[PDB]
Amino acid sequence: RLSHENNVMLEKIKDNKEKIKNNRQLPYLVANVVEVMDMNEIGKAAVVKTSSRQTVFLPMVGLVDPDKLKPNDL
């Protein structure tokens, strides 16, 4: 049971990483994180500030350490 489950879940991890890969494609926009909030206090949600002058809010961030984002972090 454990062997088959582990062998299948390694492949499903590879599938998840591949599904991540199909959206981590260039080009990206570059934004400076304005401030990171934990909206659950009222799950980390940041407020990026794109170089296109748009201050886009995010319901939640992903693919990036939510605790390792500081103001003025490209």
For another protein, the binding residues (CB under 8 A) are 2, 5-6, 9-10, 12-13, 16-17, 19-20, 23, 26-30, 32-35, 42, 47-63, 71-72
Closest separation between CB of residue 43 and another protein, Å? 9
Closest separation between CB of residue 68 and another protein, Å? 14
Which residues, other chains included, contact 37 with Cβ-Cβ below 8 Å and sequence gap of 6+? 44, 45, 46, 47
Amino acid letter at 25?
Q
Closest separation between CB of residue 35 and another protein, Å? 6
| DSSP 3-state of 45 | strand
Lookup: tokens for 71: 């103001």
